[PDB]
Amino acid sequence: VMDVMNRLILAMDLMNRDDALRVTGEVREYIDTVKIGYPLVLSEGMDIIAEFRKRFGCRIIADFKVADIPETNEKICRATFKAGADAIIVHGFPGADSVRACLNVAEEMGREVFLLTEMSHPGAEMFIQGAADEIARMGVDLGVKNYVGPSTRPERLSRLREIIGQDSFLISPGVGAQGGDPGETLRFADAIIVGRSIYLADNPAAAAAGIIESIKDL
Amino acid sequence: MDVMNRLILAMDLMNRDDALRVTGEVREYIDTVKIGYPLVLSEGMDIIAEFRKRFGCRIIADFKVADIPETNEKICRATFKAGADAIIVHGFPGADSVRACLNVAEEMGREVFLLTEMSHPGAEMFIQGAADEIARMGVDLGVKNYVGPSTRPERLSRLREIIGQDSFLISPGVGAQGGDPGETLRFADAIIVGRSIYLADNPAAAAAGIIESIKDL
Ligand SMILES: O=c1ccn([C@@H]2O[C@H](COP(=O)(O)O)[C@@H](O)[C@H]2O)c(=O)[nH]1
Numbered sequence A: 001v002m003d004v005m006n007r008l009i010l011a012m013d014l015m016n017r018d019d020a021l022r023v024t025g026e027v028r029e030y031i032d033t034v035k036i037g038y039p040l041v042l043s044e045g046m047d048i049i050a051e052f053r054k055r056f057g058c059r060i061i062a063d064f065k066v067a068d069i070p071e072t073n074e075k076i077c078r079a080t081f082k083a084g085a086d087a088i089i090v091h092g093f094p095g096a097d098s099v100r101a102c103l104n105v106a107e108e109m110g111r112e113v114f115l116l117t118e119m120s121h122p123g124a125e126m127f128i129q130g131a132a133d134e135i136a137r138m139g140v141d142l143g144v145k146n147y148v149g150p151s152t153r154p155e156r157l158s159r160l161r162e163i164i165g166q167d168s169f170l171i172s173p174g175v176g177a178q179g180g181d182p183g184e185t186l187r188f189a190d191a192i193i194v195g196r197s198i199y200l201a202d203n204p205a206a207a208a209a210g211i212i213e214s215i216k217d218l
Numbered sequence B: 001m002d003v004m005n006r007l008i009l010a011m012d013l014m015n016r017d018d019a020l021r022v023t024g025e026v027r028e029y030i031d032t033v034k035i036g037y038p039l040v041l042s043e044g045m046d047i048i049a050e051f052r053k054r055f056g057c058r059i060i061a062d063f064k065v066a067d068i069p070e071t072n073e074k075i076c077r078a079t080f081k082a083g084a085d086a087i088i089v090h091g092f093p094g095a096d097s098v099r100a101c102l103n104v105a106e107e108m109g110r111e112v113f114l115l116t117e118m119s120h121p122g123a124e125m126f127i128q129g130a131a132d133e134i135a136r137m138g139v140d141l142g143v144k145n146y147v148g149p150s151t152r153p154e155r156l157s158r159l160r161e162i163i164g165q166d167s168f169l170i171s172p173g174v175g176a177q178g179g180d181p182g183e184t185l186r187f188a189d190a191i192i193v194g195r196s197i198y199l200a201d202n203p204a205a206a207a208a209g210i211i212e213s214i215k216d217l
């Protein structure tokens, strides 16, 4: 599995190139893994991935929550890996064929797929939660090794961990801004994803240092 | 939304030259183009303005938005800023995530299309069993534009039943995925067609044939 420095992944969702670069560079010493999503990519272009690689020695996870039909998923994955992303996050709710398509491209292109089972926001309780256990089981049966679960619902994250086993890799968003706690989340997740709590702080570096200090024993 | 010939082109080619050429070859048959991530992540969001400059067509961004509320807002804002007239949003992530999109849409005067049931086989695993409730949620939220599967006419019909004849409904899955143009239009206001057109040796003739087959409607 990827070796995430300090078990902390930066969710760089600022939508300005200069601000995104400035902030990421300031926390550079505490993180070696950055999660880039559509807010930044649709504002600055996929070339932002290469720029982060050039400026920082950071691993890139594209949080695109792929959720299309199989054929389209393949194209999305190919475009994303061509851009230099190390891994891509895919939605499990659209079913096995859609996930398999992503795994096929990842295998062919030598990259990784992360399966998003249950989401962290309140609305996730409406339809995703009830299917999350089966989505995880589906992922396990498909050979998925990397997963995404909610920091906001410890009991759910714990169940996800059980389903995928200790060997699987698990990252979890919803820490900070959404209410999740760093330490509690790392009881089940291999690494935590943190966005606003860091990038909106007056001193992003200090915010990141503070989070790491709080989980030092972990 | 008045879609010419009730036909929406799914422009999923990933080369700017090919996408513009093919879209130009069928420009006389359509005035509505659906652009998605295959093209946008390969050529950039500036491609939307290029399409408007060269064709003037309306643009539907099929981004199947499926993030948390906060991030959905950012995605829609970025998308409408690029010139998209509408954006397709997944309903599976819940009401708050859909409302987030509706908020930005209202603020920027654009439209949100709610995707309720997908057209591929995998949609049967988790999406289908929640589809009716997702459509009802859309109605409660005041959504007026929807996306349903051409590949399952009975499901498309149920979707139409739930949203009413006043709501607008578009449907992908025509051609490549097995859906029939005419049967789909029995329930949907417009059909979405990608490969059956853009992969054809002669795209223009392909579009003309599809339109010819539905001249009655
Ligand atoms: O269930 C999920 C999956 C992914 N994210 C993503 O993780 C980040 C959380 O950011 P923040 O709340 O720390 O600012 C965002 O990029 C968001 O899109 C969630 O928050 N919830």
Ligand SMILES: O=c1ccn([C@@H]2O[C@H](COP(=O)(O)O)[C@@H](O)[C@H]2O)c(=O)[nH]1
Pocket (backbone or CB within 6 Å): A068, A069, A072, B010, B012, B036, B062, B115, B117, B118, B119, B120, B147, B148, B149, B172, B173, B174, B175, B176, B177, B192, B193, B194, B195, B196
């Ligand atoms: O349930 C859905 C929702 C959207 N699309 C989209 O509609 C187009 C269908 O293209 P094609 O099968 O006509 O080539 C693609 O852009 C695809 O991503 C589907 O096929 N199924």
